[PDB]
Symmetry: C4
Subunit: 381 residues, 4 copies
């Protein structure tokens, strides 16, 4: 996990959302020293447990109420239970990763500080801060608007199904914990995306520096710069590996949540489109599909960009080789080429899969297979 001053807002968001139980102090040098915060550790654990318990209690209450709102039919019951469980698992994995990833965070931040010192010429504090804050604000505003629309639609629906001998508004009220879990999930995804995008951006800056310092006494300093760039590349690869070892289970559960959410939301939209019983519900389902796809991209695109930027440095090094005649510089470039030959750049989600754009294709196939089956089941019943 990345904790930097420009992105300190995302860190605070994750901290109040039970995902970053760390205490950060800004040194007089502008560096952010990080340590364990037991107060926030226990706060995060207790909040996660309490919110999960409340979410499942509300689910049971809806299922066991006089007039269930969402948990009405067996198919609807199972689909909504899976929808809640995927979010619960994703947030639990994120919280667990944030709790037991302090050493990885420290190592990643030290490596990033060294790399930024190496790549100080391409650092943009203002632009990085604004990008991080914009991404966080957009994600939070989108999820807030979507939650408001969903809760209003479900409130209106429950009012339509209201009977004088029972209150169905409380059934919708009891689903608030699920939306809180959604906010926590949004914060976790924002943090992961920020870290991965930072790694990819640093890879791109390293490649730009390589191409601008070698393709556009003195040779000794140039070789020193090349050695520093190679060290930065290896350190960025190790930072990617640390991010994987820390949040791979979280990313895997986020991907599973995206898949199941797309399937279930498409199924519900198809149901409402066949019955044509409501229109706001249909539009809210389309908005949910768009949000789920956007967050799937949020978790996929960063790793793909990082791998792409890291794997294109070898071509630059080959060009340098073909355009370098100095002995020691040629040897340094040869060392860099050998180092790049054996880089593991792709992001691994606990070894289950490689997080890149190809996953999307697979997802589509899965969404094309399960959804249809669900439609077939609906026709059968």
């Amino acid at each position: 996990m990345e904790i930097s001053q420009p992105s300190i807002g995302i860190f605070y968001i994750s901290k109040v959302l039970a995902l970053a139980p760390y205490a950060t102090v800004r040194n007089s040098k502008g560096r952010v020293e990080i340590g364990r915060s037991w107060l926030f550790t226990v706060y995060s654990a207790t909040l996660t447990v309490v919110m999960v318990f409340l979410t499942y209690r509300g689910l049971l209450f809806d299922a066991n109420s006089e007039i269930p709102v969402r948990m009405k039919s067996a198919t609807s019951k199972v689909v909504t239970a899976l929808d809640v469980s995927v979010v619960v698992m994703a947030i639990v994995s994120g919280v667990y990763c944030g709790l037991f990833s302090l050493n990885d965070t420290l190592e990643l931040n030290d490596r990033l500080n060294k790399i930024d010192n190496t790549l100080n010429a391409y650092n943009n504090f203002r632009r990085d801060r604004w990008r991080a804050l914009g991404m966080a604000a957009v994600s939070l505003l989108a999820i807030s608007i979507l939650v408001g629309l969903d809760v209003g639609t479900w409130m209106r629906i429950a009012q339509d199904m209201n009977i004088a001998q029972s209150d169905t508004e409380l059934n919708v009220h009891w689903y608030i914990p699920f939306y809180s879990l959604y906010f926590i999930l949004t914060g976790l995804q924002v943090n992961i995306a920020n870290t991965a995008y930072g790694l990819g951006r640093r890879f791109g800056r390293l490649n730009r520096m390589l191409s601008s310092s070698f393709l556009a006494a003195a040779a000794k300093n140039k070789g020193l710069l090349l050695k520093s760039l190679a060290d930065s590349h290896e350190s960025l690869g190790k930072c990617v590996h640390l991010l994987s070892n820390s949040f791979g289970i979280a990313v895997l559960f986020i991907l599973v949540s995206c898949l199941l959410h797309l399937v279930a939301t498409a199924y519900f939209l198809f149901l409402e489109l066949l019955s044509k019983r409501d229109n706001g519900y249909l539009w809210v389902q389309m908005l949910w599909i768009c949000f789920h796809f956007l967050r799937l991209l949020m978790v996929v695109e960063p790793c793909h960009l990082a791998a792409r930027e890291s794997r294109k440095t070898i071509q630059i090094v080959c060009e340098i080789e073909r355009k370098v005649h100095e002995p020691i510089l040629a040897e340094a470039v040869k060392k860099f080429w050998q180092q790049l030959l054996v880089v593991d750049a792709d992001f691994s989600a606990c070894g289950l899969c490689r997080v890149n754009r190809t996953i999307l294709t697979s997802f589509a196939s899965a969404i094309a297979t399960y959804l249809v089956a669900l439609i077939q089941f609906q026709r059968t019943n």
Copy 2:
């Protein structure tokens, strides 16, 4: 995108079809200088928007008519809507790529000019021009014949379903925009195929030159020739990467369109074969299947050939190494081998997949899975 004098006819076809908004002037040296053409840029954008709007308006009119011709049943409505939407997305992606790919086109054409100067001995202006014109004419004639057959069959069908209190011929007339979109798609596919086949042909010419100049004072010029060949190989790889970065979304949407078209056309053919209500409709559906498969091959085979030709140069270089004793020539061949070791030859469609013949197998599986399901749905209903 490739814009060369031999293939200038394909460029003009794409230009009048809203896919190549570029102004080309032939220099006194025989070179084609390319620049932005704002008149044709706005013409392409406006034509694309207007034709898409007309296509969807005709779709809605058919769906909302007294006697729908194609958009009659829910299954038929959805299938025809997807059929129109895939074409719309493919042409929109092609137009967008042509609008925002001027720099890539310029770089690709400069690289191709340099490579052709390097490989001037194997250039065939007459044969290249005739191949390009033949491919373009065959594609346009096939799509025109297919559109005529489809529109005539649908006109006859609508006449069969005609009732004295409504006109169903106008419903078929309103589908003309969809066929115009088909023509635009054919032009885009022809342009992409021409560019990719040119890249693969240049790879093959480079390999032939390598095998004929090294396996079938003077050594200094031979090493110079080898350096030029290696530069041409790297430039061809970069041209493939430019073509990908420019038209990957277009190729991905073309592949999706081919998949969904094969599925839907097979479903319609199966419907008519069960009902046995018509024969010309069945034959037109078979012709559509053949056309879709042929264009899928048109978009797949070029990339596969390019990758195959680029990946077989390393064996030639190894043979040269084993058959070269000169010091400087041996060093140049070693450099070439190292360069070839790390080439990314496969064509990437926005990173979602690698465009090669293997895709076809996957496609078959997909076509075997979805189609069957659709058949199962038909049986259920």
Copy 3:
């Protein structure tokens, strides 16, 4: 294609079966010179066309008879038509490959002669001849027994369905061409398996020679032997590539035929097991499943073995490097290691897939997917 004296029996079998239209003369040196045989070329083409026409004519006659035997229901009609068409396509592809693969055959046989001269110490004429004849005899006897069982079972069935106003035995008689196509397919598969197994066996002999001459004046001859072994390895790789370029479409159609045959035969067996209307039919279906799986292995295992044997030579070369101190021998071993680093050993079926054991797993999944669907369709109807 391989044409050697030990395996000349397989060549003659393929020749009388319209798959090897070549004239072979044994030189006084024991070498087999190969040339085009126009008499057998036209014989093969005419026989293939005539047998395909007769097979489809018998299919139509069964479908259009008073009491169809096999082509009775729409599902049965489609399944039997696909069963006949896959065999027809496989044999047509094999015949086409044999017709237009004379140059590849000549090159492969020259390369194999050179390799055998290099590996003369491990050549076993008697064992190779006996293995080839045993494989051919086993395949032909198995297909003959299976055809006899199938035709007898279908004759008995047609007698059971016989009515005084029609003869159903002629319907079974008209399916003889399909069994002739099966014999041709068996011959083609035997030839392909013999060639691929020969390539893999030569790879294994090369590896054994490497391990016995280097891991178990004089150094100059040892380096000469190593150079010959490296040349033999590259020549075996090129022979594999020639076999692919010649019979890849045939192997692809054989794989498709195996897949569809397994699916259809399992479906028919499941039908008869639900109806429990016959027992000999069930056992014949199990025998057909076993034969199809055995020939799938016959076409898969050879390529897998060849790739495995070719890819394990690099480890032997690394051991030699770690155990070689001589300068020129060390340089030769380094050259061999570099050559082995970039070998394309896997067999490619026209680029659609890599023929190895992994395919089997995919096949299973496919057989698990389509078959079930077919069962689901049967339940629906």
Copy 4:
């Protein structure tokens, strides 16, 4: 297969379970010499045959009884038959591997002895013995508890279905052989997991030794140590290959058994959850699902860990290269890097698949596809 004094308990368990027909004598040096034990060879073969025959006889008796307990419906009959057959095949493959893998076992144990002598500094006899005994005891206790729960639940069920004119308790008694087969399968899986985890642990110890002896006269001994470490790495790779060549069919059948068991157990749990006819049966089905998933991990995680540990040594070697200046040590590290460049670390199950965590994802998809279909079939019927 690994046979070491710390894990001698697992060896004895496998020996009395018909999986390790070897006689082991502990030498005065503490080494375990291994040889063939014909008494235990015939005991293992006879026990396997007898238990398989009894299992299938009990299956038939249940199917042919007055009141079948498990083999009642066609769907239930097929599912239970497949459940028994997968276990039978897995245990038969394990027994066959143990019978015909004496040479591989001897080679693996010699290699492991040499490696342990090389890595003596990181050997922990007490910890290894306790881990092996704990894994064996946990597996055996879990399977025993699960078998007791299953047999008690089925006994109670058969008592519920008891009629005065027939005894259904004997039907459950006749399924004891299936549980004995389950115990044999658990022993085989424990042995395979122990061997693979030992290989991965030795890989990790080798990497730790590399990082602690090079990254945390004398140079000659350091190079000797590096040569020994490289030899140990190659020997561990060859040990992994021996384990594959010996037990790949067993691992493949174990994976198939896990897949089919998960599918069938989930189907049965879904059945009981729809009928809601019992609760203990539901909980036993959940326990069975957990046990099957845990053993799938038991067979997958070891190979993944071994490959991961073996593939991360190249990065350590690159760091050593970048941090080594001595001539002979630099040459040794270069040799080690070249050796590591071409390592085949992944475990292969007879070439059908690579055993790693990715398989799990595929499994899920399969479980998501077949299970649903089975549910669809249940709805249809």
